[PDB]
Amino acid sequence: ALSPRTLTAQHLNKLVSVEGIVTKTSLVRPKLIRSVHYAAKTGRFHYRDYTDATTTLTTRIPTPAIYPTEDTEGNKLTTEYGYSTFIDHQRITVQEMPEMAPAGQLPRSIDVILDDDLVDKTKPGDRVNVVGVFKSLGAGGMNQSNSNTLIGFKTLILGNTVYPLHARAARQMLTDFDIRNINKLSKKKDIFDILSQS
Amino acid sequence: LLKKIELIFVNSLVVIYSELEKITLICDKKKIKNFPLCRALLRGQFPLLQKLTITGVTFPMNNQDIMNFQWLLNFPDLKELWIEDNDNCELSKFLQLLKFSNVWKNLEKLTFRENKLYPIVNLDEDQPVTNDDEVPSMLFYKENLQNLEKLDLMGTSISGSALTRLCEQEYLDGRKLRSLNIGNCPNIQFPNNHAHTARMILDVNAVLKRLSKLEEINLSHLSSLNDSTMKSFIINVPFLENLKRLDISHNFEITGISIYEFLKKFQMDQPLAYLNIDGCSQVSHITVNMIRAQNLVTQVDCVYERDVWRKFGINSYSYS
């Protein structure tokens, strides 16, 4: 159980929970995960799976997001949307709570990836707890086109659940005991004075 | 005096033959747009012809006698038939021939491979009666296929139930069958799959009970063989004790999990002799290195970069 400050390189590839405030939510985009193609002469439906470092918890070989256009025999393919499969994808920045940041330091932040039904579960300014796998991705400048010796690797949380918060939950649950107490108090003749004095 | 003739018609430009023993006709399907020996094969007889191998030709549309394999009745004693990428042929018409004549006293091996996906063929077990006062037509599937050692149906759109019916009817003999190739057949689904039409199901338990002594299985390009479906093979390990050579290559689904637990339960039988998983993008390199290291297979091939399977001469006589 961490925050965007105390989340540390020792935590990479572990399952972590981070508390913070959401900022800079990306647009929602469909991410291609499988495409299906009718080979016009052959009659078979070919298909192709896709992978990147966000779609999987393990570093499977990447797939270049290219659509097929020809069969092995050279027969022209046609892409079949509606049988092809896309997940919704969203990237959000969770910022450290300013109340927690130590003396004279500004809040740290980290980027979370959310997929399918987790998308749009938060808007900016939401205080949140995110659970997910903290990961690294990309080449980190090890690819020799990058001369810079010092830059680090990009890192993310691949999200598994998102809880909104106002603990000191954003929407409080009410027991029937709460319902009955709330109604009981409402019948006290001077309840407006009681609540406003409270 | 010619006993064995081969023709490899690389390009195009514009009666009794007792001597012959083997005819191999191979064509560039792109350049050749007809069927060279069509008149000769339908008109003549080649009564001592042991092996016939026709690939890449294009059957004429104007001749249902060709398309129904009516000529193919001409050749008794035909120890082996190989027929591959014959673009306008169909396994349906072939099985209709096999229904209605005892065409061959003996086939040791059959190999049929149509290229394009024709509609679903189910085993046509309908035995009609002209009248119930008259005989039902004797169906010659048994005595035609009773002899087979090698059955190969790669790419042929045979439905899974058709193959189970071939085994339940005991048309395929089992006691003599040794090598089965059903790769690239999109109409095969295994029992654990929830998504199907029931007559595409293969009942591997029934099949492997029937034909238990077989050596060599080929399921390459059988995308339907996901990891869940491999569980059916795991529990049916006791019925395939003769199996030495297993090709499941170019399966883009099969994770190393199924591979490993299959070889581990097989080890409860002594390694499997040989296994092919070339092009299988999902088998983890460390798993296959474990397979080598713990010696669960005497040889295993993992050329991930090998794009294609049709080694000419060895696996296929389709030209180039």
Side-chain angles (χ1 to χ4, degrees), chain B residues 65-281:
Chain B
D65 311 337
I66 291 175
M67 298 173 69
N68 285 284
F69 302 86
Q70 212 70 353
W71 48 270
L72 184 52
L73 185 53
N74 292 357
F75 314 143
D77 201 29
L78 190 64
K79 298 282 174 58
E80 306 188 14
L81 209 179
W82 189 304
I83 189 157
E84 177 168 29
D85 299 5
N86 321 69
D87 76 335
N88 193 35
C89 88
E90 298 185 50
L91 182 57
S92 59
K93 273 65 171 180
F94 183 88
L95 292 171
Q96 286 299 327
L97 167 57
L98 271 282
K99 193 168 173 167
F100 292 134
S101 173
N102 189 32
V103 51
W104 301 304
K105 293 183 291 185
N106 188 338
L107 255 63
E108 302 296 341
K109 310 189 195 147
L110 174 58
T111 296
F112 199 110
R113 301 181 185 167
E114 52 174 42
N115 62 323
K116 60 181 282 182
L117 177 56
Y118 289 99
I120 321 304
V121 306
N122 297 289
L123 183 59
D124 187 17
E125 292 179 296
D126 174 28
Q127 192 173 16
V129 287
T130 49
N131 288 284
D132 291 83
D133 196 42
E134 296 173 43
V135 293
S137 61
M138 292 298 99
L139 303 189
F140 305 99
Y141 287 133
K142 186 153 177 58
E143 48 265 60
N144 284 319
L145 308 176
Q146 170 57 34
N147 294 63
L148 281 170
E149 175 172 12
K150 178 189 173 86
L151 176 58
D152 182 304
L153 291 169
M154 221 185 80
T156 57
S157 73
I158 183 174
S159 80
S161 63
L163 180 50
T164 63
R165 298 313 303 149
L166 287 175
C167 296
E168 198 277 299
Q169 296 297 118
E170 312 197 44
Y171 297 157
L172 266 285
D173 166 82
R175 288 171 50 76
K176 298 175 195 299
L177 192 76
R178 304 296 288 288
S179 51
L180 177 57
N181 181 12
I182 59 167
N184 201 7
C185 292
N187 303 330
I188 307 299
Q189 273 72 19
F190 297 90
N192 296 100
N193 201 328
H194 60 86
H196 61 87
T197 73
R199 49 176 59 265
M200 294 197 295
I201 294 298
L202 189 73
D203 180 359
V204 292
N205 172 245
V207 169
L208 296 172
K209 272 167 54 63
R210 184 61 57 246
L211 40 61
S212 306
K213 74 148 66 180
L214 83 177
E215 303 291 312
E216 174 159 32
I217 285 185
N218 180 5
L219 315 169
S220 55
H221 319 276
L222 203 65
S223 59
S224 185
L225 190 71
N226 308 63
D227 281 88
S228 184
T229 63
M230 278 290 291
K231 187 63 170 183
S232 67
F233 282 71
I234 271 72
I235 64 182
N236 285 287
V237 159
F239 298 99
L240 48 67
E241 298 188 338
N242 269 77
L243 201 168
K244 289 182 179 61
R245 294 172 42 79
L246 178 54
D247 195 332
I248 58 186
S249 62
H250 300 82
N251 178 321
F252 287 69
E253 294 290 346
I254 186 159
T255 318
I257 300 149
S258 296
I259 303 296
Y260 182 82
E261 68 171 347
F262 179 70
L263 277 321
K264 193 184 176 71
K265 296 309 185 188
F266 187 90
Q267 169 66 357
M268 310 297 88
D269 179 15
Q270 181 55 218
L272 178 64
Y274 159 80
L275 185 146
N276 183 15
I277 41 182
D278 287 354
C280 289
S281 60

Side-chain angles (χ1 to χ4, degrees), chain A residues 120-136:
Chain A
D120 292 334
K121 286 299 196 85
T122 45
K123 63 202 177 297
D126 286 350
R127 187 177 151 208
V128 72
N129 188 310
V130 173
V131 188
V133 184
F134 182 48
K135 285 198 76 66
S136 54

